[PDB]
Amino acid sequence: ELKHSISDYTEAEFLEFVKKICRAEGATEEDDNKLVREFERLTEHPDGSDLIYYPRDDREDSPEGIVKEIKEWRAANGKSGFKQG
């Protein structure tokens, strides 16, 4: 199914983005990263890719905390959001 934006995805569906990347890595980094790249365009997030790969400081390294980064960041930045569902 196609979406109009990341705001079409709910918080949960997007929180599955990361959970999905965690499982659907494929094999080589390429199959993992190619998922990351599309999601990171949807978020327009800077370090979104790195969110998955390298934990920050006071952030929760969890699929939820990775979402929370993107969530808190975009909300402060005037980006799109998620759908509430």
Domains defined for the chain, CATH in brackets? 1-85 (1.10.1200.20)
DSSP 16: H
Nearest CA among 14, 2, 1 for reference residue 85: 14
Residue 83 DSSP SS3: strand
The torsion defined by the Cα of 67, 19, 35 and 77, in degrees rounded to 10, comes to: 0
Q: Mapping DSSP to helix (H, G, I), strand (E, B) and coil, where does residue 10 land?
A: strand
Secondary structure of 36-66 as H, E, C letters: HHHHHHHHCCCCHHHHHHCCCCCCCCCHHHH
In angstroms, the first-to-last Cα distance of the chain is 17
CA 4 to CA 85: how far, in whole Å? 16
One-letter amino acid of 61: D
CA gyration radius, the chain: 12
Q: How far apart are CA 39 and CA 37, in angstroms?
A: 6
Contact 43, 69 (CB under 8 A): no
Technique used by the depositors:
NMR
